[PDB]
Symmetry: C4
């Protein structure tokens, strides 16, 4: 369970470093610094306005922004599910 | 698990072919090409603005658009859940 | 699994009959007929704009509208989860 | 299962007492009283407009509002999942 939690933190930090670089100048409210980025990627991970509120306005400037977010959503959402199920199993 | 992942891809492509045809002229930002369509159906599958942001404006032009989206949402969301649980078990 | 699917259909129809009556005149776009209602309660069940988009504008006219929606969300979301898990169990 | 349901209620009430105090004057539509607060934290827990609709406008006045909501979301969403799975097992 600890190895799963460690993998997500490393992925979350690398993704937020990547996102800061990619979309920080064009969209500074969302990815202007590692802080703003980690908060946006948590919001994207929970799914709240991931497309209409974040990806669609982003994709309008960066046409292939979906190559980052969709695989990010596929990985993090799977891992978070796997982590939460893992805690439940390592309790009974 | 591989058979589940293959079934979802085939369904996702057929649905995105269908959606392109159905709502591409009336709503080209959302379903104007197979690309735009696959991205919209992923967004609809995750549930983000599926009704207020997508289905309601669509249904306003195509009254029975819900005959496609609701069963699509029922199938894909079930399959994705089944696939993710399948990886955890295996 | 069949008994679970039957329970949800009966609940969904009764709730959509109730909602049509309660909020149909004040909010006809959302609950103006059993059809419009079943579609809104499915949207509410999936969670898409349940509060900001539906319950908050409703509660503004019907202060206690939350006595219907929150318990509806607690029951249907639990049952749908229980139904989907039930299919997975009755397969392995 | 009962102990899990009791833990969530205590956390939900304490969080709604905390939120009322913290953001009630600056955002009274959302956290103006324990009632308004419990309804907002249920909405935040379900995830509906948690950031764009709630946390972002809040954070604009309280820069570190995320120190309350993100850990609240991490705890309640985990507990609700654990509770619902618990009923299914029992
Ligand atoms: C999965 C872990 C997710 C961790 C999320 C951390 C969010 C950090 C956000 C943040 O610190 N700010 C928000 C910037 O919008 C900066 C303001 O608080 C000022 O200090
Ligand atoms: C479950 C699989 C989900 C697959 C998602 C595929 C998204 C495809 C998006 C796409 O290719 N475009 C964005 C269309 O909005 C086209 C433009 O990037 C060109 O430039
Ligand atoms: C869980 C099962 C959910 C079933 C959902 C059924 C939705 C039915 C919606 C409907 O029929 N209309 C939408 C009205 O807004 C009417 C228009 O199609 C006209 O005919
Ligand atoms: C997980 C438990 C979730 C409990 C949810 C409680 C919601 C409380 C809402 C409430 O009582 N009001 C709405 C405040 O917006 C007050 C008004 O109805 C008065 O008239
Ligand atoms: Na959701
Ligand atoms: Na959403
Ligand atoms: Na959502
Ligand atoms: Na939303
Ligand atoms: Na969600
Ligand atoms: Na939502």
């Amino acid at each position: 369970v600890g190895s799963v939690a460690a993998l997500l933190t490393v992925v979350f930090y690398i993704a937020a470093v990547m996102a800061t670089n990619l979309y920080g100048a064009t969209f500074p409210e969302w990815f202007g610094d590692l802080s703003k980025s980690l908060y946006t990627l948590f919001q994207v991970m929970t799914l709240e306005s991931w497309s209409m509120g974040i990806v669609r306005p982003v994709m309008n400037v960066h046409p292939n922004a979906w190559v980052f977010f969709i695989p990010f959503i596929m990985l993090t959402t799977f891992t978070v599910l796997n982590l939460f199920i893992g805690i439940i199993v390592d309790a009974m």
